[PDB]
């Protein structure tokens, strides 16, 4: 809630099990917290529609997890890419060559 200044890992300790959807969401924010250099904040958001049974499995699977959130980090790079290229388009579009 008001303790949105610190990290989410700290929230975990300061957030009961029912506070899942709050802080770590499923378990997203914490994993992407390590991959925060990108934008963990918004990443968890989109991928928040993930399973709760898989959330636990993610924290137990460094290989299977990081692989999933790996793409998550990419969804961000594309998120700000297709968003800025809205009205700020200088280059021409594709031609209808069939």
């Amino acid at each position: 809630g008001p303790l949105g200044s610190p990290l989410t890992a700290s929230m975990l300790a300061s957030a009961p099990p029912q506070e899942q959807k709050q802080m770590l969401g499923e378990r997203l924010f914490p994993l992407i917290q390590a991959m925060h250099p990108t934008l963990a904040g918004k990443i968890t958001g989109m991928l928040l529609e993930i399973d709760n049974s898989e959330l636990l499995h993610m924290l137990e699977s460094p290989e299977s997890l990081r692989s999933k959130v790996d793409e998550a980090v990419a969804v961000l790079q594309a998120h700000q890419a297709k968003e800025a290229a809205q009205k700020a388009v200088n280059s021409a579009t594709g031609v209808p060559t069939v």
Binding site: Q20, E26, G41, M46, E49, I50, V69, V75
Partner: peptide, 22 residues
């Protein structure tokens, strides 16, 4: 629109409720 790759339901994070639950 903004299509995601991982989750097919890329939506903002709306706490309070268990988003992505059944």
């Amino acid at each position: 629109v903004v299509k995601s790759n991982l989750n097919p339901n890329a939506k903002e994070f709306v706490p309070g409720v268990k988003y992505g639950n059944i």
